[PDB]
Amino acid sequence: EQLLEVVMEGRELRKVAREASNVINANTRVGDVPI
Amino acid sequence: IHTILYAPNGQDVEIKDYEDPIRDITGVNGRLHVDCQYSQGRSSATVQY
Amino acid sequence: MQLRRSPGMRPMDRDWHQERARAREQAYSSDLTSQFSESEIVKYELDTAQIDGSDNPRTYIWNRTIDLFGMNGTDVRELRNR
Amino acid sequence: MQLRRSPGMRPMDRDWHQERARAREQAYSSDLTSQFSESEIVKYELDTAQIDGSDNPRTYIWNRTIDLFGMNGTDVRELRNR
Amino acid sequence: DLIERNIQRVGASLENGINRVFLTELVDNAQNNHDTAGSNQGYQALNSAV
Amino acid sequence: ATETQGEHTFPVEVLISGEELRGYTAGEALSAGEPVYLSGDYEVSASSADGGEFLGVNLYDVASGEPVALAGDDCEVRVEVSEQVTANDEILPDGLGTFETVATSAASAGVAIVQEGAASGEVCEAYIFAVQGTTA
Amino acid sequence: ATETQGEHTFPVEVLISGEELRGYTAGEALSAGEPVYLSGDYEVSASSADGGEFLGVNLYDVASGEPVALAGDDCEVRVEVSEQVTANDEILPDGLGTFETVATSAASAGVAIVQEGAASGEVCEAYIFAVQGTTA
Amino acid sequence: ASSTPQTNVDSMGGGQFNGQDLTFEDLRDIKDVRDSGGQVAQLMDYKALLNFGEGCEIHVEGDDETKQLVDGEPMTLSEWLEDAFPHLDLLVLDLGGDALWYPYAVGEIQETITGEFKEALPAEPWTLMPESDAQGKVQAWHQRTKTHGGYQTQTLPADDLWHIVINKASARDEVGISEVLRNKDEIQAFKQNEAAINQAIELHGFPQRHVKVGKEDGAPVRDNDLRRVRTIFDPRTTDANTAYFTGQDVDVETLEAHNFDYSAIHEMDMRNLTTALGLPLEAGNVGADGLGSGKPAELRFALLKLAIKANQRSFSVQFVERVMRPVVRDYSPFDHEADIRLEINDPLEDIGEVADLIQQVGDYMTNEQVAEKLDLPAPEDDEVADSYRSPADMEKDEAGV
Amino acid sequence: NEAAINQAIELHGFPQRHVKVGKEDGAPVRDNDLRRVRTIFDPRTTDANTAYFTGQDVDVETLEAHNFDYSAIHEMDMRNLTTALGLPLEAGNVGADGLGSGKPAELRFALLK
Amino acid sequence: NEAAINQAIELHGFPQRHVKVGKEDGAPVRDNDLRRVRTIFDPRTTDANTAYFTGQDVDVETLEAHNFDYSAIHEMDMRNLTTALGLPLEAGNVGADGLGSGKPAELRFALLK
Amino acid sequence: ASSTPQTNVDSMGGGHSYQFNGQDLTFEDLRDIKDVRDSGGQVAQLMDYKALLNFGEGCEIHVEGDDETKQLVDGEPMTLSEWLEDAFPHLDLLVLDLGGDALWYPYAVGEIQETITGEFKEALPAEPWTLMPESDAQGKVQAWHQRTKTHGGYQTQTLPADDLWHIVINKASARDEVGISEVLRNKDEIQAFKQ
Ligand SMILES: [K+]
Ligand SMILES: [K+]
Ligand SMILES: [Mg+2]
Ligand SMILES: [Mg+2]
Ligand SMILES: [Mg+2]
Ligand SMILES: [Mg+2]
Ligand SMILES: [Mg+2]
Ligand SMILES: [Mg+2]
Ligand SMILES: [Mg+2]
Ligand SMILES: [Mg+2]
């Protein structure tokens, strides 16, 4: 005899921001974009 | 005139960095145990104004 | 923080499964108070285990007072008509 | 002539060093009468040793009645911020 | 590198502590004293202390 | 206290943040998130309705006589309130296994401060900052 | 709060000791060493006078709506006082962004104990030992 | 068939790391086992020394036909490779060591300032983890390195690093397995029992004196009174000459040394650990009954040599394919599609058995083949090298006839 | 059986000190009192040549290491497993008497080949 | 017999701790009282070098590992099974005394061939 | 590829002050190795046996195509092997002494020296506990920092990683230029033995 060594997942949300926008990897926590 | 230094670990000043991953802080801490004593205080003369 | 006994963690504990199986195999009835300690009932959440005596092997085993045919220990759920 | 116990010779005796170190690690307070034999107080000149309980490891070790987290036996003068 | 700077500050601060302990013992517990009485300071005071 | 996600009910994690964990003996059966007080030598029991009876909150369900982990003061905890509460309210053990406000109680001073408000019968988030004993 | 060395003025490090540092949203613009209290759900604003409004001191300058770190009631801190204080004085917020004594305040209990004395407008060193919320 | 893999490979992660089958923390954990020293580290170092410590040789098929002017002087591809990699015996031991400890050995190609080849430069394997595509091939390398009080992290393309994997989950496994992490439980079991033994030796390994004072059911003795007795019987001041004189109401009892078989516990730990790491028990300085001689011995040394051969073959192929061929292609006048092989020597050869073989069947081997088996340079004259009867036997005839 | 052995070695492989306090049929000793006795006899600060001085009503007993043949259990497990996988026993770093030489050795190696 | 040995090793192969509580012919101890004692001597939270302090009325007894020669039982089972299947005894990883060399070996190998 | 390494090397530390860095080793850690070496007994003899095994049996210098090197050095012919055997007359002792010190300490380290005429004198070794390297962010040693005892205190000085040389037997990685002391790697085992 051995357990069901499994875990059922919960709800998983849709992750898209990183594709759906311009991503800046900033050098500083605070900064400016010139317009 | 003797500078007596003591450390439970090693001999010199003990200076360590450590990271707190709960707060995202590096702490830098220094410790030393010290005393100073003459073996022969007659072997020194002070100059006084 | 979650301890091994904390209520959200119990389903992850290998012992919580193993002792609930142990309790199912060991009961004669759904009446927990007559069979288990308050410690066992709380620690292993035995109210929520389907305890009723139906999974105890000894529910199904012949245990006759005079056994001419050497037949005690036989389990009825192993007969051909089951 | 000088004997091992003679007052001018005590600082030459290895045991006078070793036993004063022992005495500092034994104590919980400066009260020598509470802690040491009157022979030891005289033989090792324990009045002149800085006995105060600050050198005893047991002053700094945690020893709670119940320990669910393995805290007991830690020495506070060995923590990160000490 | 702030961590190198902080290691340097901590090391300096300990060394300053040693120097304070040293100089305080040295000055307080010297058994000889040349009192210059506000006069003949410099070499003559230094030779007198020797 | 419990959260619903579809069919499922999940127990809430009681201790949000906190360095202050200590082990006592249960003087009676206790359940996760109950406020408790000293009832004998290292023995801990459910707090009654007003001041003078609070050491911390129980972290897991116990039978009588079992070892109990408490979250003490310096801890942030998810606790059920029997009353509607708001941020900056001081709260106190209610005597019913919940907390209530100091303003509702007979007491003048609380044991925890609400950081995140809740309706009656609902989970607030609060910081435990004091313990209360017998002052007469 | 500031320290002078020669020509130069330096910022004072608010935190002397302690690890009870916690995160909130600023309900308004706040400044380092300023006492704050809960103005909303996980939101803090500058403390008014005479008690019932203190969770900790703001550790660095922030604009409104920014996340803010706060030193809580196990920390040892450098803070500006509106009046002369001395060792063993209990102190609490002024309403002015500083601290004053329980002796001058209309309140009866403090939140920090002065460990090193200071004149009016100077920086004392104090140990934060309590928080104060709404008791009614 | 097809030109692209059409089975999937169980490896494309959900997160924003590429799944991180091991994380940088696990890689530091391997580094921490390695740097901790003691018996565990020495066993894994013996594993590295067996697999790679005996050094290497480079072969090319049709090497003579490669003869080309490199810099006015002629070279073969073997001669060029031996000049390109002067210290390959050290590099093979270093990379082979890393590729047993960690999931992979990994490194850069390096150039002189003039842009001629300098070296294959290994990189610290605990600092690097691969990121890989839906067909399991490595596309980028992500590197995290210590700095004062924290870390710097960077990403490099798979284009200009190289990597080698000894231990694999499958033939498609381009990421590999750490044998340390694969056996971490046995390592923990060993280390915990070591500490348990050490503490038990202190408490229980030595007898301790127990002086009991006062008569049973007689007058009670207080702490004040025991301090004076303690002063008399103090072990710190006692010797082999010391004798004791007492009334009837003082008893000098002994807590005996309480025997337990720590030797059997150590031998069990070492058996579990050596077998888990695939070494023979003998590597752990532990012996065994009925295993020291005959076919029982010959099997375990055969199993060891097979394991060594399998690792060597796996390493050799990947070093040639991922390191040597690119270096020939990019910095050499020779053909990179030449049939290069890197052999690694067998650590457990008996030269006396080789000499016995040469005496018994040399009459069927060329002088070149004999020189290869004997680990010597092949003869200068290709005729004497190619011939089957001894060069000394040809000399005595060529002179004597 | 590996798990059972490892757990049994921790519980039973090493001696453990059992201090008993008070006289049999005498005055009872309470929990508070034992805390002070524990402070005297604590293994954490004890060392190899520590000596004890007591009244007649303190007994330093020992839970002995309770011997069991875990070597024989490991050998039995290894014998079962190796033969189940068709390997010779020696692949498990376990030996056997009589089997190590002569026609008995010739046979097991013939079976393997 | 394999099943019987495997079960017997679990029950009897390892010593088991038996804490006896209360004075003989003294005050009785109930289950809720034993729960608190079980919390102290719990093998789950006990470690290799744990030490105990008690009054005179707590006894840490041991069920010793009760020895039985399961090696001889396995050898006998294998001796039956191999001979019943007409295999030589050596195929079962067992072997026998005085049988590994000389005319005794020549005979068994002749019979097998 | 590149003419400089693009992989980083995990190994910042210290500056002028002490740090419990883990990658670096202090003059105290170095003088601890000196103390294990000179305090004697079974531990010291085992590490001396380790040195004698690795380096005690002496050495031989080879040059491939040595005969082709035949040249007049000072009105007399030599090969490179013959010149090297004159340059290093007692190389066997140097190999044992350096090789032993490189098993004790993380490295052996030393100078090159010249006669007054400027011809080669010897590769004079340096006392390894007195010296520690400074290394850059990409992994090379750039300077050597020396601390040496004088009359109840210390001299200190710095030297470029130019006219010194150093040898490392034991390494943390194939890219390690500073190495590991097998003594400090096993300090806990040594103290367990002594206790
Ligand atoms: K009420
Ligand atoms: K006012
Ligand atoms: Mg800006
Ligand atoms: Mg004088
Ligand atoms: Mg503090
Ligand atoms: Mg906190
Ligand atoms: Mg606090
Ligand atoms: Mg009396
Ligand atoms: Mg009585
Ligand atoms: Mg009765």
Residue numbers in the entry:
A (entry chain KF): 115 to 149
B (entry chain JA): 348 to 396
C (entry chain P6), D (entry chain P5): 1 to 82
E (entry chain JA): 199 to 248
F (entry chain JK), G (entry chain JI): 2 to 137
H (entry chain PK): 31 to 45, 49 to 434
I (entry chain PL), J (entry chain PA): 226 to 338
K (entry chain PJ): 31 to 225
Text of the article:
Here, we present the near-atomic resolution structure of Haloferax tailed virus 1 (HFTV1), an archaeal virus thriving in extreme salinity. The tail has a length of 560 Å and terminates into a baseplate with three radiating TFs of ~190 Å in length.
The portal is a dodecamer of gp13 (PP), which spans the capsid through one pentagonal vertex. We found that the symmetry mismatch between the MCP pentamer and the PP dodecamer is interfaced by the intermediary portal interface protein gp21 (PIP). A pentameric ring of gp21 (portal interface protein, PIP, brown) integrates the portal 12-mer into the fivefold vertex of the capsid. At the portal-capsid interface, one of the MCP-bound magnesium ions is replaced by an arginine of PIP. In addition, PIP also has a putative phosphohistidine residue at position 17, which forms a stabilising H-bond with neighboring MCP monomer. Similarity, but no definite homology, could be determined for the HTC, and the PIP had no hits for structural similarity whatsoever, suggesting that this part of the capsid has a unique origin.
